[PDB]
Amino acid sequence: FTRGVYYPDKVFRSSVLHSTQDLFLPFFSNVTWFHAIHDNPVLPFNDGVYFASTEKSNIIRGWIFGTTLDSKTQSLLIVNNATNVVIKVCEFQFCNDPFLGVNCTFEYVSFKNLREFVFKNIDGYFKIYSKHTPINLVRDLPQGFSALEPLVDLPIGINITRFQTLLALHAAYYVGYLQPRTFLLKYNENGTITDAVDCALDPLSETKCTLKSFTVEKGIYQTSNFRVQPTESI
């Protein structure tokens, strides 16, 4: 739907429509749906990952990021056990199938609930955005809009190509991928992003971005340019 929008920077803006290009989850794109009933595979990281999960009992407690995740390289580990968030970037020896039962360069220690996250790597910096909100829905991701604020930026310098989650065993989760799309972000009077337009979603959205507005008056507008792309080089 319209999930996967985060504040692109740390500047306060209000009562304004701002056009920005960054790695956002494309609107109405497909996100892989994983289950935790009666499912913690290794997924590609690509150019950045949108992650979301639904909880009733805090089953999902962490993440692993790296290339091989087997003590051969440095791998970012994030774990939240009870009230203590733990972040480490050691060359961890992970299990053949990592789970939690019910040469380190960094360490830090601190359905009813939807917890959305954005994980991206720019020039060695692992940027984390997130938002927690109450929900009343078991089947799937709730439809609606909520922007994610940044919380953490870790200068790990780790080449991340794959990642894996960590489940608490005695909670479905979703994995999407970010693209360098241009978005028109609508900031309300309190500086909260309340809506957004994905400028490559469809011709109407292209029109809205061109006119810098979420409303399009009746008429014909020139919004872009069609160009046939080459298939191969000669």
Partner: protein
């Protein structure tokens, strides 16, 4: 403009790959979020498809009935949102046809008037 192939000495013309402006034809978003797209000055090849001299119009239904021009496309073609409703394209009407009952001995003289 053209090149000579360096391995086999024949001349190849270079024609830049098809391109053109893209326009979006839309009723206001206070009515509908349905749109039609006009690919300006292209054929309906490289791109409910109507070929006009303005370009290749996709998403608008071609209607035989003329109407007053609403959202102009070009080359005599206008589009509008009508009936269940959708975007239609048609050749615009220039007005109602009305012959004058001319003869060499007949005059029409107004008998009443209105102040407007």
């Amino acid at each position: 403009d053209a090149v000579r192939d360096p391995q086999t000495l024949e001349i190849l013309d270079i024609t830049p790959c098809s391109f053109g402006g893209v326009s979006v034809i839309t009723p206001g978003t206070n009515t509908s979020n349905q749109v039609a797209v006009l690919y300006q000055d292209v054929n309906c090849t490289e791109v409910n498809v109507f070929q006009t001299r303005a370009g290749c119009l996709i998403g608008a239904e071609h209607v035989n009935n003329s109407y007053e021009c609403d959202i102009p496309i070009g080359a005599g073609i206008c589009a509008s949102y009508q009936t269940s409703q959708s975007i239609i394209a048609y050749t615009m009407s220039l007005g109602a046809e009305n012959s004058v009952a001319y003869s060499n001995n007949s005059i029409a003289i107004p008998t009443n008037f209105t102040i407007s």
